[PDB]
Amino acid sequence: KPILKDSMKLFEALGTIKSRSMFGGFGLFADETMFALVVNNQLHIRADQQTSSDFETQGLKPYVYKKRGFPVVTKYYAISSELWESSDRLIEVAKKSLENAKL
């Protein structure tokens, strides 16, 4: 349920967190850079090009936004339930994603 608010609150470890409508859900931004997406009541983290290609080769699938039969494959991967139980770990995952998003 309160996944959006709980995500934004957790990631304040990265400074001010901003959100706006992105890809059918809500994007999360730090330092003017999107690093996360909350959609289908699930937290997703941004994989850079290299990470996303690898993930796909290894059988993982990113979130896809659809409208009237037009799909948009995103760079956003649903996190595991276990990661949520691991607050500091998840914070580090977001920090690394934000870092890769800025490169």
Place this chain on the structure above:
Amino acid sequence: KPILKDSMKLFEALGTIKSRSMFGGFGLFADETMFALVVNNQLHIRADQQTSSDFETQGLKPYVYKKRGFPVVTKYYAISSELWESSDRLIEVAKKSLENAK
């Protein structure tokens, strides 16, 4: 519980809705003007100076953000459960608050 998400969706008619860390919670902005705040799992609406002054005289208390003994009194008043349960009316209240803020 997803007050924030629900609120961001509810207020889509007012303008483009964005949120950000504000005053210990999350501020809601319509085309760059803040009109609401989600904190303490409750939606709060912005009262302009006149409204807030009247409210305090009339025994109502705004949300106060506090860190390490430093309190910051805000202009944000918690809505009633009845108003939260009355979607169209809440949109109009937010719309007025936004007008008052501009």
